Design a protein around this ligand. Structure first.
Ligand SMILES: Cc1cc2nc3c(=O)[nH]c(=O)nc-3n(C[C@H](O)[C@H](O)[C@H](O)COP(=O)(O)OP(=O)(O)OC[C@H]3O[C@@H](n4cnc5c(N)ncnc54)[C@H](O)[C@@H]3O)c2cc1C
Ligand code: SF4
Ligand code: SF4
Length: 472
């Protein structure tokens, strides 16, 4: 039908399970659209000129085109259009925060008509295509005689590997873990993204012809000059893993565990491998009171994965207001509905205890009015300082890059202050010849789709450089 039906229809997301039932299991919380409902929700588009849904999507899919090709049957052509510009569409549709990228700037969203549910239609059109064999690996026609190396198996690494293998090269990936996929499989919990689609996509990648090297750290089992001599070009996509800390009176007691360790062990125990720290360790929250520090999406993941495993009472201390939350806002409402209690504008001061933490003494800060440059300056209130009973606290402040030049044996890699190495904009080439670096280690605490775009751009640049070098 002529697809301008936002006038006489109302937006409604797919099926959801109630809160009293969500708290038990570890599966997802949403469901896939039905056919007659997807063909209706994809019809509310307006095919507007100058589509803001595409200007603000970091990978810049052709959103109106497959929204049209979905609203008229014709699902296979829609799958083609969607896949031809994005390597992991379903993963993006599942995890990408849409209220700030695409759904937050739709033209009918700016006019209080609600937003066309884009990511859910992405999921629908990209998963119903998987069941009927419309997905196939991109095996190169004529195998080109060159070899390219990458470091890391995250989103950027896998995207670059797929692009290079499609061009015709021979790729070799080098991941530190045993199950490749990066923090897509060890950072993000199960209820957000299921660990089955990730292994499905990595199996497809391996079927395309990629060679996998698990349990292979660059620092220990290799060296950057050796790999530089092996292949023709290497892509540093190792991400950021050196976490942050806090120095306060009482910050040396027991049961003060970093967030990444907790999340990793939760992912493992959901998969298996029977780590002992889940049996006898401080990485369980069965019958304890949990308190997490800092904000962001990491805080949301931690608090939810804690409230799933019992956790008689959970609290989260953010040191700003609610509207400045770094992550999305659907997960905040989800956590509130599931049982979490939030404490906005609070900063930790100390930990009271003897050998194990018994409580967290915190202060209450006040934010000034936005400055002429758009920056609020908080100041701690002198009177109100309080203490919360805490059985297990989790520090989830942030993440920073490691010291790569002093660990990759090459002290000539140019670096900024924070650790993100410098790189040109066009070719995505590192200071040194032959080596390239693009992904999350160049940006900071970005999202997945930015990593995908950086990986694709670095792949194109590496192809151009290798062709120009073997050319003459
Ligand atoms: C919805 C959402 C939720 C998010 N949740 C989180 C979250 O909970 N926590 C979080 O931290 N980020 C989170 N992010 C951020 C995002 O996941 C990452 O910034 C991004 O995925 C990292 O991209 P990358 O290319 O650096 O890959 P990464 O996955 O960051 O790359 C890590 C890989 O590098 C490998 N590696 C590391 N060091 C070495 C080495 N020396 N040698 C070899 N291999 C090495 C690791 O083993 C791993 O395979 C989230 C993003 C979104 C959109
Ligand atoms: S969601 Fe809105 S802006 Fe995006 S294509 Fe549809 S009508 Fe245009
Ligand atoms: S990748 Fe993210 S921003 Fe782009 S269309 Fe999909 S959900 Fe929207």
């Amino acid at each position: 039908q002529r697809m301008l039906g936002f006038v006489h229809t109302a937006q409604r997301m797919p099926d959801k399970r109630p809160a009293a039932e969500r708290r038990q299991d570890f599966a997802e919380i949403y469901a896939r659209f039905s056919d007659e409902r997807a063909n209706e929700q994809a019809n509310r588009c307006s095919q507007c000129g100058v589509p803001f849904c595409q200007v603000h999507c970091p990978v810049s899919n052709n959103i109106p085109d497959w929204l049209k090709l979905t609203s008229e049957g014709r699902l296979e052509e829609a799958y083609e259009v969607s896949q031809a510009t994005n390597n992991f569409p379903e993963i993006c549709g599942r995890i990408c925060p849409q209220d700030r990228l695409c759904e937050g700037n739709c033209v009918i969203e700016q006019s209080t008509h609600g937003a066309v549910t884009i990511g859910s239609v992405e999921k629908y059109i990209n998963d119903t295509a998987w069941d009927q064999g419309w997905v196939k690996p991109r095996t190169p026609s004529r195998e080109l005689g060159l070899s390219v190396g990458v470091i890391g198996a995250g989103p950027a690494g896998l995207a670059a590997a797929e692009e290079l293998r499609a061009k015709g090269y021979e790729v070799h990936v080098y991941d530190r873990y045993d199950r490749m996929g990066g923090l897509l499989v060890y950072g993000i919990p199960g209820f957000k993204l299921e660990k089955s689609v990730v292994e499905r996509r990595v199996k497809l990648l391996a079927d395309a012809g990629v060679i996998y090297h698990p349990n292979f750290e660059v620092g220990r089992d290799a060296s950057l000059p050796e790999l530089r001599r092996k292949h023709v070009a290497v892509l540093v996509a190792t991400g950021v893993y050196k976490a942050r800390d806090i120095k306060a009176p009482g910050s040396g007691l027991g049961n003060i565990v970093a967030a990444l360790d907790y999340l990793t062990t939760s992912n493992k125990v959901s998969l298996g491998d029977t780590v002992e720290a889940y049996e006898n360790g401080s990485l369980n929250a069965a019958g304890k009171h949990v308190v997490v520090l800092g904000g962001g999406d990491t805080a949301m993941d931690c608090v939810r994965t804690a409230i799933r495993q019992g956790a008689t009472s959970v609290k989260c201390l953010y040191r700003r207001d609610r509207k400045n939350m770094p992550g999305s806002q659907r997960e905040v409402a989800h956590a509130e509905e599931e049982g979490v209690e939030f404490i906005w504008q609070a900063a930790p001061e100390g930990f009271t205890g003897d050998t194990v933490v018994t409580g967290v003494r915190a202060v209450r800060i006040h934010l000034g009015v936005a400055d002429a440059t758009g920056r609020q300056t908080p100041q701690v209130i002198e009177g109100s300082e309080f203490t919360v009973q805490a059985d297990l606290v989790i520090k989830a402040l942030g993440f920073e890059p490691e010291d790569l030049p002093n660990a990759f044996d090459e002290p000539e890699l140019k670096v900024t202050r924070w650790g993100t190495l410098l790189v040109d904009h066009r070719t995505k080439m590192t200071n040194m010849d032959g080596v390239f670096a693009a992904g999350d280690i160049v940006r900071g605490a970005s999202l997945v789709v930015w990593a995908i775009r950086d990986g694709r751009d670095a792949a194109e640049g590496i192809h151009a450089y290798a062709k120009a070098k073997a050319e003459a």
